[PDB]
Symmetry: C5
């Protein structure tokens, strides 16, 4: 069981770590069919998505996808600093697998 976001991100090829140490610049949320997703950006220009839940996601993952969108919204609205994002780099925007918040 990984002890931090780096070790978890290492479990996957084609994921990569981004260190932002910054608050989210914008938060975008959609309920449109087949675009039930979230998109965040940072002032450095970086853009990331939470994937649309699909048949490729087991049910436990779909539930965690909903959690992640909860986390990003309240992080945005509290101006909480994001430390790192672990993101799949084979999707555009890169897709969030894990997030850390610290200080």
């Amino acid at each position: 069981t990984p002890q931090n976001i780096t070790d978890l991100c290492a479990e996957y090829h084609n994921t990569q770590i981004h260190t932002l140490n910054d608050k989210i610049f914008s938060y975008t949320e959609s309920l449109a069919g087949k675009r039930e997703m979230a998109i965040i950006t940072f002032k450095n220009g970086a853009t990331f998505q939470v994937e649309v839940p699909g048949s490729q996601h087991i049910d436990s993952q779909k539930k965690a996808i909903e959690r992640m969108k909860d986390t990003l919204r309240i992080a945005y609205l509290t101006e909480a600093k994001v430390e790192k994002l672990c993101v799949w780099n084979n999707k555009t925007p890169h897709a969030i697998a894990a997030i850390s918040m610290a200080n």
Copy 2:
């Protein structure tokens, strides 16, 4: 997969972007039968709804609809600046498909 609300909105028919760059002026919600909905207004008069859930709303739209109502409520209470809305404009009040917030 789009990277922002404007490109996401261009992927559908019967949608348009509204640019507000303002906080929500009023939040209204109802539990009354057949009107289980939320309504928001802006000081310029613009009025929008989150639609009552129905049979046109498909799989994971059901969760996204509830999340949107959560988001509008917490956005209203935090006075978060709303940047743009993607809305379905074949309904009145315009039905929100997506929202973007930027400081």
Copy 3:
């Protein structure tokens, strides 16, 4: 489709609008069986409930009843000004159908 809380309230029999323009004075919540409800009051002594879910409600209302209790709790804790309430006046305490918040 109604555009605001007053038009919405007009669509139902035995309802009326209370214009409070004030924060919630008390929030009360119960989990006891058959009394799973919420009660709020205002400075002026006005008392309102969120009814227990029962046979008078249709399936579409079930999530909305839970949302409304969420809304009243966070409204109370933020000291948010509630503008109007649409209530069924054939219940005691009057039963909330819709809420608007502005300011």
Copy 4:
């Protein structure tokens, strides 16, 4: 239908009202099997639980049990003043049935 927590408490056997008029000193929460519960304390020593969901609860209470734990958690973090608690006194710690918060 009762109009306040005191009237609601009197509708049940083995209940009593505690008047605290104080914020919550401590919030404890457990996910261990058979102890999925919450325990709160006040500064005077009073200790109360939200019971583990079991057969003694009707289905309607399950949702309300989860809500009560949500409410105690956020009440604690916001240092909200708890007015009164309705509890079952045939359980140790006394088990919460209803809570009133008042400004």
Copy 5:
């Protein structure tokens, strides 16, 4: 039924109490399949996880695991002081069984 986290912790095997009396330093969350988990750390270097739900967890534990991650997130964002953690010391990181917060 135990009256505090220390007594609750003693009911289980392979558990131990950690007394932190500090806010959470970092909150980490993953949505990767079969890694749906949360990790928190404190400035004393202690690292703890909320376990991935599965097998070891009955029905009521699943709900409680999700609640626990909700609680740690909002505790982190509010910088609430956590008093103690009851953890299974037969997992790495030690897995959280219960949390106490005291203000």
